Structure 1
Amino acid sequence: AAQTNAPWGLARISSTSPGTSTYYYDESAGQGSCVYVIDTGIEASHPEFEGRAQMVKTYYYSSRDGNGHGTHCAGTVGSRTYGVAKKTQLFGVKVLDDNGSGQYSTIIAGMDFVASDKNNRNCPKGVVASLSLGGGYSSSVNSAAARLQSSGVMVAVAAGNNNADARNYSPASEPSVCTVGASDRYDRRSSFSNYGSVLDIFGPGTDILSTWIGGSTRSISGTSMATPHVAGLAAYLMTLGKTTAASACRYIADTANKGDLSNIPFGTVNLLAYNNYQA
């Protein structure tokens, strides 16, 4: 399949070169997979989700996304125009309030919720969780992400936006999950992206157009935007049968575009997520 005039990041993930604008992908499109977006919620009524998004859990007075961040991330995973995996099922878990803030204890509860809740869902092709959030180092937060991964969920987490070594942030610093840095449309490391040995992969993170609340769209930047590209890619590849939740991060690194990013510090992987789709 070919989506013309796609957001640059979608075109980038199906290309050996920057500077193109068509996204190419297998029409299976993540059908039969599920992606949990653990964030501020998802505006499931947005036409871009086509009925494939729903809220499954909130820790606050509403499950609605009063911020936009979670809706934007969900759109990059799986919206019809802005998404990597255009036929996946999206499940929202609202661990962050409408200001984007959340206690680590709530975030941990949300991760353990997903590890159990997947047993209540139909995801024959596999389960992914996208975590566009984080804070300072916490062994308990890292352990929660490790449990979620161990339970059979492909966990993708944002590296963080401090232009610093991600070893000091959680869940970014958990070794067993997939830690995602951000790149721009010219294949430069995004100016804010964290780096370091704990990163597994880069995805498009600067000026990413996606869904927003009020049935709208907007372009924003962050490792929060790169993470759902990788989560959606994992769901897409699991639907194709090319990898599993346990091995998807490694498979994505194995098959990535290699050595093409600039301003990658010595000791950080130079790997850009790539679907290797041959039309």
Structure 2
Amino acid sequence: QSNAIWGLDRIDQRNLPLDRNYNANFDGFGVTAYVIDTGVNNNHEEFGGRSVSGYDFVDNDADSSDCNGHGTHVAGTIGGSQYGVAKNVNIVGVRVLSCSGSGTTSGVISGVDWVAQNASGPSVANMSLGGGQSTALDSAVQGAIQSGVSFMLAAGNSNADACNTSPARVPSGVTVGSTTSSDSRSSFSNWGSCVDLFAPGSQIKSAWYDGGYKTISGTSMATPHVAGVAALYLQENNGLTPLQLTGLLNSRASENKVSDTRGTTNKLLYSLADSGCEPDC
């Protein structure tokens, strides 16, 4: 891409400086990203008819439309034509948070269970949300990954240990911290032994609920970046189990690139099939 926004620009290369290009060998055609969030604007122009409703566990209806913005934004980072990682992925909105972003643990669990029960082909869930400890929530996410669907999970935004947050602390999940375009850990991002890797989450431009656009920061913006490359990886290999996908995200990641990691493993999202440091050692 000749004029790529920074986050896409970053994940296709090993080192700074940025080159204003997002290169891709895949687009996640044939895979489906389940976005567990405030819903998603199916009619947004970034999706070109590739987003549909799943279910709405806040209002108990069939229309998972977004009235907050956040879930449209993360869905745009996964599969938006201009500002997305996997530009022909399928998006399925699963609405578990209200217009104000508030949700119950029961409703979020219902969305996780729904994804486990309804995923058909190559699939990946994205949970750009977090809060206090919850073994019941942890247990539902642990169960959906056991059924064969990889869950990307935001680390949290409190400059704290991600091990005290659910669902972030679930080991079998892929817990994602946030970075800026200078390769620093975003100053808000959670950290520690529960975080598997970093991805662009500071100042990310993506779709908004109103059909236009917005640029916001959070581990919620970081997470869909890696869900997006999960879909790239899944098109390349449809039969990747959660374990194999987690491994492939780990071994393809750029190493020792991030500053102020605070005891986090120093791995940065990399979207192409190269291993170690290869393309630029």
| Pairwise TM-score range, normalised by the shorter structure | over 0.9
Identity %: 44
TM-score by length of 1: 0.94
Q: Which residue is equivalent to 2:208?
A: 212
Task: Note the residue ranges of structure 2 that are not aligned, 5 or more in a row.
Answer: none
Is the Cα–Cα contact under 8 Å of residues 24 and 277 in structure 1 kept in the other structure? no
CA contact (8 A) 2:54 2:92 kept: yes
Would you say the 8 A contact 1:10–1:23 is kept in 2? yes
Secondary structure at the aligned position of 2:119 is classed as helix
Contact 1:204 1:226 in 2 (8 A): yes
> Aligned AA for 2:255?
K
Distance 1:68 1:16 in 2: 31
CA RMSD of aligned residues (A): 1.4
Do residues 226 (structure 1) and 215 (structure 2) align?
A: no
Of 143, 157, 162, which residue of structure 2 is paired with 1:166? 162
Letter in 1 for 2:234: M
Aligned residue in 1 for 2:258: 261
Moved runs in structure 1, 4+ residues, more than 2 A?
A: 60-63, 276-279
Measured after TM superposition, the shift of residue 20 of structure 1 is: 2.4
Report the more deviating stretch, 138-147 or 239-248.
239-248
What is the deviation of 1:214?
A: 1.6
Equivalent AA in structure 1 for residue 146 of structure 2: S
Deviations 1:210-235 (A, max 9, x none): 00122101110000000000001001
Question: Alpha-carbon deviation of 1:277?
Answer: 4.9
Query: Does structure 2 conserve the Cα–Cα contact (< 8 Å) formed by 1:127 and 1:154?
Result: yes
Aligned equivalents of 2:156 and 2:43: distance in 1?
Answer: 29
Aligned amino acid, residue 161 of structure 1: N
Tell me how far 1:251 sits from its aligned partner: 1.0
| Residue deviations 1:44-70 (CA, integer Å, cap 9, x gap) | 101110000011100234532110000
Report whether the alignment pairs 1:245 with 2:244: no
How far apart in 2 are the matches of 1:76 and 1:88?
11
- Find out whether 1:20 has 2:19 as its counterpart: yes
TM-score normalised according to structure 2 size? 0.93
Give matches, 1:15-54, under 5 Å: 15-18=13-16, 19-26=18-25, 28-54=26-52
CA contact (8 A) 1:11 1:20 kept: yes
How many residue pairs get matched?
A: 270
Judged with a 3 Å threshold, the aligned counterparts in structure 2 of structure 1 residues 20 and 277 are, in CA distance, closer, same or farther, namely farther
Q: Which residue of 1 aligns with 2:133?
A: 137
Preserved CA contact (<8 Å) 1:14 1:277 = no
Instruction: Look up the match of 2:94.
Output: 93
The structure carrying a bigger strand percent of its residues is 1
- List runs of 5+ in structure 1 lacking aligned partners: none
> 3-state DSSP class of the match of 1:48?
coil
Q: Deviations over 1:132-152 (max 9, x none)?
A: 001111111111111111111
C-alpha separation between the residues in 2 aligned to 1:242 and 1:214?
34
Give 3-state SS (helix, strand or coil) of 2:81's partner.
Answer: coil
